[PDB]
Amino acid sequence: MNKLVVLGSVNADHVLQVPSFPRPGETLHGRNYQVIPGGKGANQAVAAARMQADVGFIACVGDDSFGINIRESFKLDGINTAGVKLQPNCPTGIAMIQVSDSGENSICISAEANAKLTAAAIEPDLAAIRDARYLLMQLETPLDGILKAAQEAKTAKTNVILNPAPARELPDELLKCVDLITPNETEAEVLTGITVYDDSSAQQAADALHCKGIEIVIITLGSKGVWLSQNGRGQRIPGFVVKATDTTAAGDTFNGALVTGLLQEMPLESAIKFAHAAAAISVTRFGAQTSIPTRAEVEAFLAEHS
Amino acid sequence: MNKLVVLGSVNADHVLQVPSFPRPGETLHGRNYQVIPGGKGANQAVAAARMQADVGFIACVGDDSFGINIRESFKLDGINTAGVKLQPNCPTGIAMIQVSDSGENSICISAEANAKLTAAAIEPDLAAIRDARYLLMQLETPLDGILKAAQEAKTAKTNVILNPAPARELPDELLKCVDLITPNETEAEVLTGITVYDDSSAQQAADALHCKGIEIVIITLGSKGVWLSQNGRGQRIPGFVVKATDTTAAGDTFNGALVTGLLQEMPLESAIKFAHAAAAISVTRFGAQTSIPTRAEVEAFLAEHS
Numbered sequence: 001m002n003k004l005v006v007l008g009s010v011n012a013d014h015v016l017q018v019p020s021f022p023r024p025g026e027t028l029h030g031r032n033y034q035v036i037p038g039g040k041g042a043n044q045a046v047a048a049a050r051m052q053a054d055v056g057f058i059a060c061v062g063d064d065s066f067g068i069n070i071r072e073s074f075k076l077d078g079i080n081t082a083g084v085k086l087q088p089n090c091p092t093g094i095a096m097i098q099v100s101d102s103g104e105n106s107i108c109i110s111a112e113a114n115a116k117l118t119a120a121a122i123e124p125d126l127a128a129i130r131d132a133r134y135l136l137m138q139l140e141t142p143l144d145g146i147l148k149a150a151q152e153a154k155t156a157k158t159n160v161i162l163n164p165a166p167a168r169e170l171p172d173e174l175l176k177c178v179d180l181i182t183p184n185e186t187e188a189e190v191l192t193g194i195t196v197y198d199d200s201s202a203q204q205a206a207d208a209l210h211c212k213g214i215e216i217v218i219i220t221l222g223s224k225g226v227w228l229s230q231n232g233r234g235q236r237i238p239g240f241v242v243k244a245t246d247t248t249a250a251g252d253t254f255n256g257a258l259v260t261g262l263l264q265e266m267p268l269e270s271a272i273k274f275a276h277a278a279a280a281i282s283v284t285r286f287g288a289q290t291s292i293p294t295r296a297e298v299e300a301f302l303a304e305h306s
Numbered sequence: 307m308n309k310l311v312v313l314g315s316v317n318a319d320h321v322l323q324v325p326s327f328p329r330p331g332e333t334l335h336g337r338n339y340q341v342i343p344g345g346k347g348a349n350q351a352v353a354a355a356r357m358q359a360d361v362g363f364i365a366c367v368g369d370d371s372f373g374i375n376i377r378e379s380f381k382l383d384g385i386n387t388a389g390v391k392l393q394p395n396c397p398t399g400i401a402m403i404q405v406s407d408s409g410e411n412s413i414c415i416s417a418e419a420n421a422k423l424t425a426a427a428i429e430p431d432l433a434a435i436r437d438a439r440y441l442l443m444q445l446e447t448p449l450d451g452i453l454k455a456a457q458e459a460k461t462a463k464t465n466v467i468l469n470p471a472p473a474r475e476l477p478d479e480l481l482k483c484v485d486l487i488t489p490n491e492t493e494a495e496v497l498t499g500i501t502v503y504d505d506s507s508a509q510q511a512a513d514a515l516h517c518k519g520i521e522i523v524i525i526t527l528g529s530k531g532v533w534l535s536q537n538g539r540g541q542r543i544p545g546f547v548v549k550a551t552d553t554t555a556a557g558d559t560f561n562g563a564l565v566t567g568l569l570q571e572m573p574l575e576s577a578i579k580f581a582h583a584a585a586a587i588s589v590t591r592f593g594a595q596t597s598i599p600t601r602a603e604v605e606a607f608l609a610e611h612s
């Protein structure tokens with residue numbers, strides 16, 4: 001039984017580098033087309049695995065060559081893939097991504113095989129969810145599956161960590177079942193209606209989430225670090241500062257590393273610094289899973305930048 | 307020796323429907339992802355092959371699965387692929403097409419393997435250009451290859467048809483070598499500096515091209531048909547009235563069908579009307595080569611509309 005179970009998406013990222021971002025009327029010319037392993041589910045699982053978590057992944061891939069191959073690749077990163085299902089007659093999920101020279105990115109996804117991860121589909125994985133200490137999920141798979149999983153985790157002393165990405169509204173039945181939520185600035189506002197722009201508004205958004213029954217709130221603020229709130233008490237924990245090559249998967253890397261830090265008994269503020277270091281390194285590198293650093297690299301970073 | 311040679315681009319069109327225009331930041335949920343074979347060169351060669359032209363294609367594709375596979379597919383279409391190069395360590399050209407529900411689309415294109423279609427690259431194809439009756443080209447590959455091909459054809463008495471798409475300015479050196487040019491309204495403006503408001507200005511645009519040495523000018527006018535000018539004699543030839551849902555391959559279909567009609571000894575005006583029918587069928591269908599009709603379909607359409 002893995003101490004960490006990640007449930008979420010797997011995508012093939014179809015990525016182009018762009019000078020700027022498209023305007024409705026003109027054709028943008030890109031370069032360096034690459035197909036890169038991605039998906040928020042897989043990114044966070046690979047981040048946790050590389051941070052040396054005891055990690056099992058619950059997901060759906062397609063029966064295309066990409067899907068078969070990437071499921072095998074997860075094993076090489078030490079992920080337990082018992083719960084990664086191959087979906088007949090379905091492509092693996094995709095993302096079309098454009099990354100500018102500033103590191104900014106635009107991402108559009110299509111569910112494909114990810115749509116198959118329903119509540120029914122995770123019936124054989126309910127045991128793994130129970131025996132785990134932490135369950136980490138995002139919002140790139142069907143809501144019914146995410147809800148069932150969170151419900152099952154609460155009957156079995158499993159911490160539920162939700163990265164509510166990409167942004168969408170969520171039912172109270174789910175939020176009350178989440179022990180720690182990690183929205184970004186956009187997602188915090190979608191979830192609460194409270195735009196986050198400063199300390200007081202950060203704390204408003206967080207309080208709104210606390211009222212929804214979520215004990216720990218972490219609002220990620222890009223290069224500004226994060227806003228950590230623990231039932232009413234908020235504070236900014238700054239990140240590390242680096243030149244951005246590509247921020248795709250920065251958030252995923254942060255989440256996978258954070259849960260790993262927590263699992264490995266680092267106090268919450270320490271696990272956040274640890275997660276900041278992993279995420280900062282990933283910001284300096286291109287592509288989703290290709291940017292995710294190893295534990296050794298994260299330690300070296302922390303040794304340098306204390 | 308093929309009577310028709312097409313020289314031009316090959317793209318994999320990656321198409322996604324999205325709710326809003328893609329912006330940097332939050333990931334957008336899309337839907338209905340498809341990879342459709344595309345590129346102006348391939349679309350025109352496929353159009354001609356489907357209309358049963360005796361056609362060879364000169365192009366560069368990648369050594370990805372898409373490029374390997376499409377070259378084989380072209381063969382099944384009836385296209386001579388001797389001049390189709392697979393470029394090592396290089397993906398096929400791609401167009402990332404994001405079709406927003408809100409009306410305006412986002413398009414990002416990367417040349418990839420298309421950039422390898424240079425003046426030097428087509429050296430082994432010069433014999434086929436000399437031996438053809440018509441050479442059909444567009445502007446989605448490097449100008450040096452286009453120019454080399456046009457010069458070779460000129461000294462061989464091969465008719466050169468240039469579809470000047472996507473729009474860009476062209477040197478007198480290239481235009482002098484063109485026998486028939488098929489700009490749309492936007493392209494006619496880019497080439498001449500003359501904006502096409504009506505018939506009089508369409509003729510203005512046409513005579514600007516005649517003055518660059520082009521005997522026949524066809525300005526396509528969307529739903530308004532075509533402005534034909536032969537050595538200074540202009541007229542409007544209307545198209546067909548249909549429910550247009552996707553004009554993505556309309557100009558490509560028109561050009562492929564036009565030259566095939568000409569190769570069949572249809573009088574020019576008649577070939578233009580025949581090509582209107584082919585293009586009309588295409589605008590009622592979705593995607594690049596997926597919209598391109600066969601000769602049998604065009605005949606049924608014409609029978610039904612007579």
Ligand SMILES: Nc1ncnc2c1ncn2[C@@H]1O[C@H](COP(=O)(O)OP(=O)(O)O)[C@@H](O)[C@H]1O
Binds near residue numbers: 165221242247275
């Ligand atoms: N420019 C940057 N420099 C250093 N660290 C960054 C940078 N951008 C993001 N990070 C790290 O990545 C995490 C996620 O940040 P963010 O980009 O806000 O994610 P999202 O795009 O989902 O909002 C941050 O908490 C921080 O650790």
Ligand SMILES: Nc1ncnc2c1ncn2[C@@H]1O[C@H](COP(=O)(O)OP(=O)(O)O)[C@@H](O)[C@H]1O
Binds near residue numbers: 344558
């Ligand atoms: N702005 C654009 N929109 C759609 N496709 C484009 C665009 N620019 C280039 N392309 C490429 O051109 C092909 C679209 O066909 P196109 O050549 O535009 O047809 P038409 O001859 O009707 O203009 C697509 O298959 C795609 O690969």
Ligand SMILES: Nc1ncnc2c1ncn2[C@@H]1O[C@H](COP(=O)(O)OP(=O)(O)O)[C@@H](O)[C@H]1O
Binds near residue numbers: 526532
């Ligand atoms: N709405 C339409 N209805 C019928 N035929 C059309 C329509 N739009 C384009 N066509 C056909 O497609 C041909 C391509 O011309 P045009 O549409 O101007 O080029 P493009 O759309 O590729 O820029 C036209 O000459 C005409 O035959």
Ligand SMILES: OC[C@H]1O[C@H](O)[C@H](O)[C@@H]1O
Binds near residue numbers: 040043109249288
């Ligand atoms: O967070 C980054 C990821 O979001 C999208 O799901 C892409 O697959 C990309 O890898």
Ligand code: NA
Binds near residue numbers: 246247249282284285
């Ligand atoms: Na990165």
Ligand code: NA
Binds near residue numbers: 551552553591592
């Ligand atoms: Na069409």
